[PDB]
Amino acid sequence: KSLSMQNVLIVGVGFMGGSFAKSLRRSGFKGKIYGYDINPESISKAVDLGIIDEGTTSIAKVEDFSPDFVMLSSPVRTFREIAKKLSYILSEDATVTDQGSVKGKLVYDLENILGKRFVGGHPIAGTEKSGVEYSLDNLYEGKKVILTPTKKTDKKRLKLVKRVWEDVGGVVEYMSPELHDYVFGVVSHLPHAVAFALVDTLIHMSTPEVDLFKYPGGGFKDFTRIAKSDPIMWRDIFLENKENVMKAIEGFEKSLNHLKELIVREAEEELVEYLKEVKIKRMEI
Amino acid sequence: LKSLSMQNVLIVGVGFMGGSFAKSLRRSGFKGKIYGYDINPESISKAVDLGIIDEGTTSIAKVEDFSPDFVMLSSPVRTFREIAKKLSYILSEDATVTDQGSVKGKLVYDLENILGKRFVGGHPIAGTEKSGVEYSLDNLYEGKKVILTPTKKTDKKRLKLVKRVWEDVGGVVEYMSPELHDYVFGVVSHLPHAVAFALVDTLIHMSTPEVDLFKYPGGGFKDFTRIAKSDPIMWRDIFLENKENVMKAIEGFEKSLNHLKELIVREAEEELVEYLKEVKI
Numbered sequence: 001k002s003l004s005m006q007n008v009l010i011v012g013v014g015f016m017g018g019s020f021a022k023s024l025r026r027s028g029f030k031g032k033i034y035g036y037d038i039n040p041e042s043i044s045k046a047v048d049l050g051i052i053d054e055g056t057t058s059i060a061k062v063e064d065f066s067p068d069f070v071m072l073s074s075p076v077r078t079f080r081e082i083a084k085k086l087s088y089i090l091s092e093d094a095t096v097t098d099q100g101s102v103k104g105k106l107v108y109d110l111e112n113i114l115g116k117r118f119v120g121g122h123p124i125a126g127t128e129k130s131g132v133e134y135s136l137d138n139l140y141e142g143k144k145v146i147l148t149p150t151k152k153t154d155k156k157r158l159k160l161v162k163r164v165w166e167d168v169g170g171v172v173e174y175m176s177p178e179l180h181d182y183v184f185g186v187v188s189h190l191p192h193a194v195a196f197a198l199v200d201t202l203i204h205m206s207t208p209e210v211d212l213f214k215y216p217g218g219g220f221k222d223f224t225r226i227a228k229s230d231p232i233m234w235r236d237i238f239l240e241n242k243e244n245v246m247k248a249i250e251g252f253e254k255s256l257n258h259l260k261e262l263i264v265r266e267a268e269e270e271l272v273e274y275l276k277e278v279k280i281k282r283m284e285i
Numbered sequence: 286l287k288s289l290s291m292q293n294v295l296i297v298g299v300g301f302m303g304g305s306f307a308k309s310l311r312r313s314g315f316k317g318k319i320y321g322y323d324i325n326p327e328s329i330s331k332a333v334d335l336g337i338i339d340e341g342t343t344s345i346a347k348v349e350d351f352s353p354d355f356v357m358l359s360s361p362v363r364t365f366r367e368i369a370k371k372l373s374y375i376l377s378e379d380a381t382v383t384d385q386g387s388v389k390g391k392l393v394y395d396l397e398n399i400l401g402k403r404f405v406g407g408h409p410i411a412g413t414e415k416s417g418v419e420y421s422l423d424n425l426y427e428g429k430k431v432i433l434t435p436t437k438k439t440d441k442k443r444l445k446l447v448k449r450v451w452e453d454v455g456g457v458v459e460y461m462s463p464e465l466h467d468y469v470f471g472v473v474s475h476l477p478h479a480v481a482f483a484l485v486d487t488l489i490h491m492s493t494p495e496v497d498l499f500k501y502p503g504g505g506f507k508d509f510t511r512i513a514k515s516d517p518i519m520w521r522d523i524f525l526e527n528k529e530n531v532m533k534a535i536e537g538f539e540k541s542l543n544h545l546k547e548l549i550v551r552e553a554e555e556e557l558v559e560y561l562k563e564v565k566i
């Protein structure tokens with residue numbers, strides 16, 4: 001068939017950018033796969049592992065790569081400024097998309113920056129990890145990938161990006177940018193927030209003689225986990241999606257306060273009921 | 286040969302933990318009798334069918350026929366008192382009673398007051414959210430901490446016996462006072478359970494006619510809330526029996542949550558990053 005893609009640019013050649021790179025080449029993409037990063041060593045590791053053909057830490061060099069498909073894979077807050085530079089560098093017919101964990105306002109701003117080139121996406125792909133050395137060539141298989149079109153998005157580009165994620169094995173679905181940021185503020189951002197705060201709880205509730213981290217086997221262990229998420233990624237998510245993050249935190253307090261009220265009142269059947277309902281809902285997934 | 290020191294074992298509450306104890310004791314090479322007491326006849330018959338207990342009963346009177354010299358309390362924590370009262374007459378003066386319950390505290394003193402010199406307080410930090418004797422495992426305690434909570438009142442020969450039995454099944458024994466235990470496990474165990482249950486409850490009431498938030502897990506919801514599937518009866522007993530510590534643990538947590546909230550509302554680039562770098566120890 002056809003060559004709807006010649007040179008792709010990976011912006012942010014880390015764990016997620018590298019896995020997209022890897023997955024792409026392994027789906028049969030024959031074109032040039034390029035890297036842009038602020039960290040030269042990110043570029044260096046990537047080249048040495050085969051993950052990219054050539055890169056640079058100068059944004060302007062990127063023009064010599066003539067890229068027609070850009071995957072933004074650096075922390076979300078770097079996107080606007082990178083986009084502003086790319087809007088002069090990139091052809092009118094290049095396609096730009098992303099893997100950032102928040103959409104919402106950012107998608108509208110990137111459309112305004114890159115015009116019709118932009119399509120928002122977010123793969124709901126787990127395994128935590130950081131850095132290109134960990135990137136995987138089968139990361140997106142089976143996972144949902146959310147694209148956030150608006151009435152402004154170019155349908156043919158939306159079609160391209162959707163298909164690219166199918167080639168790497170993602171199962172694609174559409175959501176408004178605003179719905180995305182409510183949903184994931186609740187189902188993703190909130191659990192990380194409370195995990196972070198739990199770990200903080202054991203810090204300040206320890207005494208000098210009694211380290212509480214010595215006893216993880218009673219429920220704490222699982223929280224130990226994506227509490228080891230990247231602080232930069234999470235600071236970035238928490239602020240960029242601040243309003244939904246806050247509303248999600250408010251609802252959790254509502255549930256936590258209900259459970260508290262029951263324990264205080266020393267209820268019992270009510271308490272048992274409440275716990276059976278959440279067990280049931282949690283089991284259904 | 287202190288096969289003499291333990292001949293007839295009674296498992297009270299033949300569920301996940303009581304059956305894991307039965308199973309590990311047998312596998313450790315115990316040749317004595319293992320009996321079961323439970324209000325659910327199905328717990329008893331499933332345990333018999335699976336070779337977990339030799340026989341058992343749903344009638345507390347009948348346990349006197351079993352002549353138990355060692356009793357492992359393994360039913361929900363708020364059942365121990367009434368059960369123990371019946372046991373204090375059925376059991377020989379030289380019988381030892383111990384438990385696996387997740388709360389200690391007052392309950393330890395109460396059980397000493399009901400059972401006299403017979404009782405030793407214990408809590409294995411082991412197992413999962415599973416419930417039911419069908420999920421019981423013969424290696425549940427290998428390399429896991431077991432906390433015993435002896436007091437000035439504890440029979441020292443019974444503490445040593447209980448201690449060794451936990452060791453025979455792979456456990457690593459340490460001691461805590463009943464009050465320290467309940468503080469420690471109020472925050473590292475009972476707290477994280479409350480918070481997981483309350484996490485799932487949140488997805489329920491933030492769902493809407495537009496959206497079932499349960500359709501999107503594995504942005505981190507799934508892994509953090511496995512323990513939200515734990516047993517409601519077991520957890521109800523825990524939260525109520527350990528209420529004073531649990532409420533303190535939740536206050537402390539809300540202090541941490543509040544501090545994170547302040548850093549976000551005001552967008553403190555730097556305090557925030559350093560706060561989240563807290564998880565890196």
Ligand SMILES: NC(=O)C1=CN([C@@H]2O[C@H](COP(=O)(O)OP(=O)(O)OC[C@H]3O[C@@H](n4cnc5c(N)ncnc54)[C@H](O)[C@@H]3O)[C@@H](O)[C@H]2O)C=CC1
Pocket residue numbers: 011012013014015016017036037038039042073074075076078082099100101102122123124125126127128129130131132230233
């Ligand atoms: N961690 C996860 O499971 C998921 C992450 N994401 C998104 O993927 C993105 C990246 O995450 P990871 O690859 O895990 O991070 P990472 O920390 O492995 O890689 C980030 C890369 O971006 C580079 N970079 C940072 N600032 C930059 C800038 N201003 N300009 C150019 N390059 C820059 C870093 O040098 C590094 O090479 C984030 O937007 C995140 O929200 C999305 C879904 C899941």
Ligand SMILES: NC(=O)C1=CN([C@@H]2O[C@H](COP(=O)(O)OP(=O)(O)OC[C@H]3O[C@@H](n4cnc5c(N)ncnc54)[C@H](O)[C@@H]3O)[C@@H](O)[C@H]2O)C=CC1
Pocket residue numbers: 297298299300301302303322323324325328359360361362364368385386387388408409410411412413414415416417418516519523
């Ligand atoms: N789930 C876990 O990982 C751990 C639980 N524990 C403690 O172990 C004890 C048992 O927990 P699981 O084995 O998971 O619960 P389970 O629900 O698997 O088993 C409880 C068994 O107790 C029986 N039972 C209930 N009320 C009773 C009564 N009044 N008299 C006699 N039998 C009764 C039930 O029919 C059931 O067969 C609880 O005190 C719990 O706090 C301790 C450490 C870990």
Ligand SMILES: O=C(O)C(=O)Cc1ccc(O)cc1
Pocket residue numbers: 217218219220386387409410411412413414415474512
């Ligand atoms: O990982 C889990 O499910 C646990 O939290 C296991 C657990 C539950 C209750 C306890 O008293 C001790 C250990």
